Design a binder for these strands. Structure first.
Lengths: 218, 123, 129, 88
RNA sequence: GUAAAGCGCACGCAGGCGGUUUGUUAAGUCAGAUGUGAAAUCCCCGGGCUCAACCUGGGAACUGCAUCUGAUACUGGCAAGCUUGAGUCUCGUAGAGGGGGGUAGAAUUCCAGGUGUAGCGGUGAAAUGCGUAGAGAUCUGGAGGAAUACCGGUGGCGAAGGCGGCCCCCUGGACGAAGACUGACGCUCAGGUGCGAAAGCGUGGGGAGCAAACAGGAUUAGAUACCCUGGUAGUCCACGCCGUAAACGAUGUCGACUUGGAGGUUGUGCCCUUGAGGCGUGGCUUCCGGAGCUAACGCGUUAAGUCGACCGCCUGGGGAGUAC
RNA sequence: UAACCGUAGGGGAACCUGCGGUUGGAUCA
């Protein structure tokens, strides 16, 4: 009868034989995600985030999906942490070494407009250079504050942010993902069987995450 | 399998097949030497090697290898088979002891005297 | 199950753990509850109860320390067609001693240490690590 | 299968009480009928195998029940095998 | 599952295994003890040959068999039960499940006759072939055999193999629901019995179409083929035999667990049942996919995941599923 | 001439042909 009454079900018969012990029971085309098997996951995962947040760690919310991009920062950026609401680059968790390099020209690029150092070169030039910000500040603008690999990664849909999760389990960075019927939870060490979609499902839990994390460090 | 399936028909062994006609569980066997051949090796190698059919004391005939940089056997000389097959030479899974019976032994060899026919050189 | 009611108990417990379940349920039995009683004191399970004066149904509560669960190892040994009976000087020692081993004695259900401390033996039941 | 006026009939002849369609004495006997009756059917057609599979079923199934009686009340066994002219 | 390996499928004797409770027994089992387990080896501690090898004291062990006194949780035996396993009854439901007998319509071929006339048929072309003894085309009547368009589906039924027109007769299984009844009567199953596509075999029928063989024509370097014109066994029926298939999900049967999504088919409860309809609750079945599993592909509640009971099977390739 | 399995017949030889099954068949059949 609580807020957990918005992500009842999703993803039709495409499903995934693996995601079964979490299915309330198929009905009306698509199946349902047994919330009673979700209640423990509802906190068990959050508990660790709350616990790790106290260790002053790091948390990267991955949600390249449109219906989650613009609406993810308020839970990560505002809560001051880490997130990637766009095309997850190839290696921003493994080949970080060379990736961070991109972050630099992004930061120093920012300072350009900062002071009068922006009125340098032809008016056209500034434009050609400002475009880099659009891309940079977007694909990295919300990870720049990461001076080293995180300690735990919380990704929205376990399908879309596929590559994202991959690199993770290769570096030893725990992953808290809210999978789904057609999702492959075998890559998530902290499954949260919920509607990978639903404009409301995303917001509620997403914001709910930063909640525990916010005061996680007391 | 399962205990039941094992109680009935357990785990069978495997009769080890000892590639050697001159068995009799012996380190070596005496022969007579039928002739002295010079058959050619397999496909990978070349050069003609020396061999010879042997009429082992137990009747069991068989060709033995005559290793060494210098043969000296006859069509009647008595040699001693030892073992150790040879690849390049098929069917030739034996070697004539160097420096035994009515055979000879490598000449002028100063290395690995034990093997072949040599015992303390000219000093 | 219909042939191995005891072996089922363990499976239902381990299967529940993996699924991060809260509580496991299944038909009760003198030996079952008896076994369920041991793991209780052993801290492997929160609590446990039953329902039905004619139709008994066991009720166990899974357990977990941190991100992972507690009972991360539970297997059987003395199953039908291949039963196991050890002495007071053969009893196994799960995980070098950390894990427990349920064993039915002439005194009742006990653990590797329990029965040993007593000086008697019995039919091994299962290994819990 | 079998006619109600017959099935519900025989049940009231072997049942140690009333409407005891469970009783082995009953069920068992109920099987012989559908069996003997089918023997006349299988006499014809013959090639009809898929029907004999069920025939054999009730046959063995009947035996599985006879063995039981012998292992629950020796008397009842020999006391029923006669009323059905069984054993042959 | 694809590496070697699930019997083609069932039923089932022996055998192995066996839901829940109480009493009882004390066989298994556990505890103690008494025998015996030769000595010597081995091992521990310790002695003597200058050390060692060696020799040597005592113990340890000899994991076993028996007997006696107990212990009674679990297994087993006996007694009385219990109901969720399994089964019976009732009433419904769907089905190309099986065996027998009917019957209908479309088409092919053939026989006869009418009209009509120099082509038809076939191929990449061609040719063989059929045509002036009149084909082909067309129309009327007749004979006969095989198979049942559409519905037909990612559909349904069956143990497997397999099973499609409509009708009747005899018959098997599956499932649901209120229920009522029996009371563990169950699971598996070497050997055994039975069922088995097609091809093939025997006797006797039948024979339209198709088509191994065989015969022509063509292709080609050749063409004992693909292609074309013919065409016999056979394909069809009865009854008996043969038992094989990439008899394939290449995945044994039975049972319990373990996130989800979309769909199909069939039963039932319920909802202004006002509706196509909406909400559940069972059976069978597709596709995607999570954890996990996997060498990878992939499998994924119909598992190749987590377990339990029984059975079949594998142990490098060739030789060889061959020889005897 | 998609291949392979079974079974049958035929042919210098691989193999060809018929009947049934399989996907361990390519291209939107």
């Amino acid at each position: 009868m609580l807020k957990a009454g918005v992500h009842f079900g999703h993803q039709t018969r495409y499903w995934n034989p693996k995601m079964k012990p979490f299915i309330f029971g198929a009905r009306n085309k698509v199946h349902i995600i047994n919330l009673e098997k979700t209640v423990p996951m509802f906190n068990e995962a959050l508990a660790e985030l709350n616990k790790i947040a106290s260790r002053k760690g790091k948390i990267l919310f991955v949600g390249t999906k449109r219906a989650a991009s613009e609406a993810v920062k308020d839970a990560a950026l505002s809560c001051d942490q880490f997130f990637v609401n766009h095309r997850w680059l190839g290696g921003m968790l493994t080949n970080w070494k060379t990736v961070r390099q991109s972050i630099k020209r992004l930061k120093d690029l920012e300072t350009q407009s900062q002071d009068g150092t922006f009125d340098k070169l032809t008016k056209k030039e500034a434009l050609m250079r400002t475009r880099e910000l659009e891309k940079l500040e977007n694909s990295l603008g919300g990870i720049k504050d990461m001076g080293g690999l995180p300690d735990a990664l919380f990704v929205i849909d376990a399908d879309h942010e596929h590559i994202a999760i991959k690199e993770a389990n290769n570096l030893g960075i725990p992953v808290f993902a809210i999978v789904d019927t057609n999702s492959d939870p075998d890559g998530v060490d902290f499954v949260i069987p919920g509607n990978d979609d639903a404009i409301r499902a995303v917001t509620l839990y997403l914001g709910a995450v930063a909640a525990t994390v916010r005061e996680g460090r007391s | 399998a399962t205990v039941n399936q094992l109680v009935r028909k357990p785990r069978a062994r495997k009769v080890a097949k000892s590639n050697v006609p001159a068995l009799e569980a012996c380190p070596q066997k005496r022969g007579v030497c039928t002739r002295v051949y010079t058959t050619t090796p397999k496909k990978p190698n070349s050069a003609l090697r020396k061999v010879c059919r042997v009429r082992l004391t137990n009747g069991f005939e068989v060709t033995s290898y005559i290793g060494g940089e210098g043969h000296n056997l006859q069509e009647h000389s008595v040699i001693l088979i030892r073992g150790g097959r040879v690849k390049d030479l098929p069917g030739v899974r034996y070697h004539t002891v160097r420096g035994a019976l009515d055979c000879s032994g490598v000449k002028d060899r100063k290395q690995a005297r034990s093997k072949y026919g040599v015992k303390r050189p000219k000093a | 199950s219909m042939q191995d009611p005891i072996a089922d108990m363990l499976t239902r417990i381990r299967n529940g753990q993996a699924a991060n379940k809260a509580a496991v349920t299944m038909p009760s039995s003198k030996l079952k509850v008896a076994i369920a009683n041991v793991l209780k004191e052993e801290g492997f399970i929160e609590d446990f109860k039953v329902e039905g004066d004619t139709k008994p149904e066991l009720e166990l509560t899974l357990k977990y320390f941190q991100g992972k669960a507690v009972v991360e190892s539970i297997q059987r040994v003395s199953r039908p067609g291949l039963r196991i009976y050890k002495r007071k000087d053969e009893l196994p020692k799960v995980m070098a001693g950390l894990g427990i081993a349920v064993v039915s004695t002439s005194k009742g259900v006990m653990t590797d240490r329990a029965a040993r401390q007593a000086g008697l033996g019995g039919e091994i039941i299962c290994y819990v690590a | 299968s079998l006619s109600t006026e017959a099935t519900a009939k025989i049940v009231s002849e072997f049942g140690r009480d009333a409407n005891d369609t469970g009783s082995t004495e009953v069920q068992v006997a109920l099987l012989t009928a559908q069996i003997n009756h089918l023997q006349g059917h299988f006499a014809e057609h013959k090639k009809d195998h898929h029907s004999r599979r069920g025939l054999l079923r009730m046959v063995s199934q009947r035996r599985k029940l006879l063995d039981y009686l012998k292992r629950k009340d020796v008397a009842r066994y020999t006391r029923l095998i006669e009323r059905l002219g069984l054993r042959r």
